[PDB]
């Protein structure tokens, strides 16, 4: 839309009030012109036709309950853009400030959110298993990191490469959540998952076995469901990432943590420099060891911790 940049205010899914970048042109639209080629949020109006209508509002105040999911989708896309720009020097997901588009209110009672190859799509949840999925900043950054991966390594979505694909989205989703310092933790989707049960989440990176996911390579799922375990086997990489960052002793292997910031720099470098569409876990380990070597030297503690972590989850 062509018009004047301005700032509106509203409430997100969790009831918190925030300012959002809007555009004025007769109506106020959810169009943020301050980042790259723009961040645009659309109303899919409970249908599955995409993208829907660019979100238009008469007075620039978004406090209706129908507005909530749009406010957070729009706002957390901006935060994820900022993270990648300020921390990794990457401008949008293609690296050239591509516009970021999201539709909310997709379908009815839809207990998911996803990057479809061209834009973000968020269901509102059935209200029991989930509440509107854009209320979770780690969900938003997880799915937007699939667009980064698609433009760089290109990890195919099945078997070990898909498991790496998923782990990379959980890692940067978590790092964005720490960057915005929004009650950060190492769990995924806890702000929007089961509104009636406190303390749980979809997955855990610090202890994947809590929800039944493998935390060691000898426990990996080898059948065919979930495209060969892409959501299940990512627990092995998630546990490795958690140990590189935070340290700990895992199946008797001790790892000295080197922190979140170094974890993000090693994995971002591995992702954009060394991973390919068919990389498998062993090649991820080699990419992460080469990245840490590039940045910190082959005899650094950083390199030694990347090795211990992968040894602890059984990946050689
Ligand atoms: Ca309004
Ligand atoms: Ca959290
Ligand atoms: Ca989280
Ligand atoms: Ca819950
Ligand atoms: Zn994913």
Q: CA-to-CA distance for 122 and 136, rounded, in angstroms? A: 11
Which domain covers residue 56, as residue numbers? 6-154
> The CATH number of the domain where 199 resides is what?
1.10.390.10
Domain count, the chain: 2
Which tokens belong to 128? 């029991």
Helix, strand or coil for residue 79? helix
Q: CA-to-CA distance for 187 and 185, rounded, in angstroms? A: 6
Q: What is the CA radius of gyration of the chain?
A: 20
* Same domain? 164 vs 309: yes
Q: CA-to-CA distance for 274 and 220, rounded, in angstroms? A: 24
Q: Secondary structure of 208-236 in the HEC alphabet?
A: HHHHCCCCCHHHCCCCCHHHHHCCCCHHH
d(CA 109, ligand 1 centre) in Å: 24
CA distances from 150 to 82, 171, 235, 276 (A): 19, 16, 21, 10
C-alpha atoms less than 13 angstroms from C-alpha of 10 in its C-beta half-sphere? 27
Query: Using an 8 Å Cβ cutoff, are 201 and 129 in contact?
Result: no
User: Would strands 4-11 and 17-25 be described as parallel, antiparallel, or unpaired?
Assistant: antiparallel
Phi, psi of 130 (to 5 degrees): -145, 160
- What DSSP string runs through 284-307? HHHHHHHHHHHHH-TTSHHHHHHH
Q: Does residue 231 carry a catalytic annotation?
A: yes
Structural domain contains residue 189: yes
Query: Using an 8 Å Cβ cutoff, are 18 and 75 in contact?
Result: yes
Structural domain contains residue 105: yes
d(CA 231, ligand 1 centre) in Å: 38
Angle at 115 between CA 88 and CA 66, to 5 degrees: 105
Nearest to 242 by CA among 221, 269, 263: 263
H-helix segments, the chain: 68-88, 137-151, 159-179, 225-229, 234-246, 260-269, 281-296, 301-312
d(CA 45, ligand 4 centre) in Å: 26
Q: CA-to-CA distance for 193 and 127, rounded, in angstroms? A: 9
Structural domain contains residue 1: no
> The CATH number of the domain where 56 resides is what?
3.10.170.10
Which tokens belong to 61? 């105040």
Give 163: exposed, middle or buried? Use CB within 10 Å, 0-12, 13-18, 19+.
Answer: buried
Alpha carbon 60 to its chain centroid, in Å, reads: 28
Q: CA-to-CA distance for 173 and 176, rounded, in angstroms? A: 5
* Same domain? 287 vs 179: yes
* Same domain? 240 vs 217: yes
Name the binding residues for Ca(2+).
57, 59, 61, 138, 177, 183, 185, 187, 190, 193-194, 197, 200
Chain length of the chain: 316
Give 146: exposed, middle or buried? Use CB within 10 Å, 0-12, 13-18, 19+.
Answer: buried
Catalytic option among 88, 105, 143, 250 = 143
Q: Does residue 143 carry a catalytic annotation?
A: yes
Resolution limit, Å: 2.1
* Same domain? 59 vs 124: yes
Helix, strand or coil for residue 115? strand
* Same domain? 168 vs 289: yes
């Amino acid at each position: 839309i062509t018009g004047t940049s301005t700032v509106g205010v509203g409430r997100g899914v969790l009831g918190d009030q925030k300012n959002i970048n809007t555009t004025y042109s007769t109506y106020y639209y959810l169009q943020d012109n301050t980042r790259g080629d723009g961040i645009f949020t659309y109303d899919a109006k409970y249908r599955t036709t995409l993208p829907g209508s660019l979100w238009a509002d008469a007075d620039n105040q978004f406090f209706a309950s129908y507005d909530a999911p749009a406010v957070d989708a729009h706002y957390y896309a901006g935060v994820t853009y900022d993270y990648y720009k300020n921390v990794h020097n990457r401008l949008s997901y293609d690296g050239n400030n591509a516009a970021i588009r999201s539709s909310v209110h997709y379908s009815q009672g839809y207990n998911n959110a996803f990057w479809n190859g061209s834009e973000m799509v968020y269901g509102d949840g059935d209200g029991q298993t989930f509440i509107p999925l854009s209320g979770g900043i780690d969900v938003v950054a997880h799915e937007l990191t699939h667009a980064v991966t698609d433009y760089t390594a290109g990890l195919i979505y099945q078997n070990e490469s898909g498991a790496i694909n998923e782990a990379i989205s959980d890692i940067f989703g978590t790092l964005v959540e720490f960057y915005a310092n929004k009650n950060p933790d190492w769990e995924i989707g806890e702000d929007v998952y089961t509104p009636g049960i406190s303390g749980d989440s979809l997955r855990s990176m610090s202890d994947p076995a809590k929800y039944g996911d493998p935390d060691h390579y000898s426990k990996r799922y080898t059948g065919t469901q979930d495209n060969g375990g892409v959501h299940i086997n990512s627990g092995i990489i998630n546990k490795a990432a958690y140990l590189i960052s935070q340290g700990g002793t895992h199946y008797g292997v001790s790892v000295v943590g080197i922190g979140r910031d170094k974890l993000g720099k090693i994995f971002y470098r591995a992702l954009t420099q060394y991973l390919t569409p068919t990389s498998n876990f062993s090649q991820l380990r080699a990419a992460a060891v080469q990245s840490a070597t590039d940045l910190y030297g082959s005899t650094s503690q950083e390199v030694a911790s990347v090795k211990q972590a992968f040894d602890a989850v059984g990946v050689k």
